[PDB]
Amino acid sequence: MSEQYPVLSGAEPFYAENGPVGVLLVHGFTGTPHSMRPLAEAYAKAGYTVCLPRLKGHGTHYEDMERTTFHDWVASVEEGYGWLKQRCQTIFVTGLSMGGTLTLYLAEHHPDICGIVPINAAVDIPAIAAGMTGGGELPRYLDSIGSDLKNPDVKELAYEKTPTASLLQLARLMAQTKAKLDRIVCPALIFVSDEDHVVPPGNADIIFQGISSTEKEIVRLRNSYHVATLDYDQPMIIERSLEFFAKHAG
């Protein structure tokens, strides 16, 4: 790591080695493993080997984030997939928002993957930096708007500023991912928050149409905003995913 700053408390990765079925969990662009930990812990308790990496540049400081490329984030996820592949003979991938993009990405590169569970995955965002920069303002940083989360008793540990260099990287990742949806053939379970105010719910439909997966479904989350893994629909996400995992374990 060319990471210059230490890991925030609560942002540590999580590994657990249980049975031969594995789940890789991928957190999002602003966030840290915190947003995915309740899922990871529930899947580990159900008997799954679980890998929840901390993406390079995340969970430290926004300056660390600034120098990373999407290639670094892919590498973090690839190394998590590799850790799982050593230990498991069945692999599922799930992730929130950008972690959903990275989940799609990984499925495109490894069809040995037995299934994917993207949640509010980002594939085509019109408002990249919705009204902080124009095409030629080019501030270094945009102030972050806060968490799009309904439940007020939980929180994200995401940075307060987003490097605009990182947004460029994110747009490039979404392009290479959306372009290659047809490469995905494993079972897909697609969560979408009706009231996502960050990633347009229509991304669900683009994912659904673009993959060549024969077993695919869209599940609507009615009581959650964008950060659904921490929101009121958390238990529903966990219970439906567990059902998904069991029914496709190989």
Q: Given phi > 0 = left and psi -120 to 50 = alpha, else beta, which region is 120? A: left
Of the residues 72, 156, 231, 233, which one makes contact with Cl ion according to CB under 5 A: 156
Element (H, E) at 93: strand 90-96
197 is catalytic: no
Tokens 């969990």 belong to which residue? 25
169 binds Cl ion (CB under 5 A): no
Give 35 or 213: the residue with its C-beta nearer to Cl ion.
Answer: 35
59 binds Cl ion (CB under 5 A): no
- Spatial distance between the Cα atoms of 16 and 134, rounded to a whole number of angstroms: 44
- Among residues 226, 231, 233, 241, the one annotated as catalytic is 226
Nearest to 193, CA basis, from 234, 249, 137: 234
Instruction: Output the smallest distance, CB 157 to Cl ion, in A.
Output: 4
226 is catalytic: yes
DSSP string over 18-58: -SSEEEEEE--SS--GGGGHHHHHHHHHTT-EEEEPPPTT-
Q: With CB under 5 A as the contact rule, which of the stretches 23-31, 124-132, 178-186, 199-207 interacts with Cl ion?
A: 23-31
Of the residues 157, 188, 199, 204, which one makes contact with Cl ion according to CB under 5 A: 157
Instruction: Output the smallest distance, CB 147 to Cl ion, in A.
Output: 8
What positions carry a catalytic annotation?
97, 196, 226
**Where do contacts with Cl ion occur on this chain (CB under 5 A)?**
31-32, 34-35, 156-157
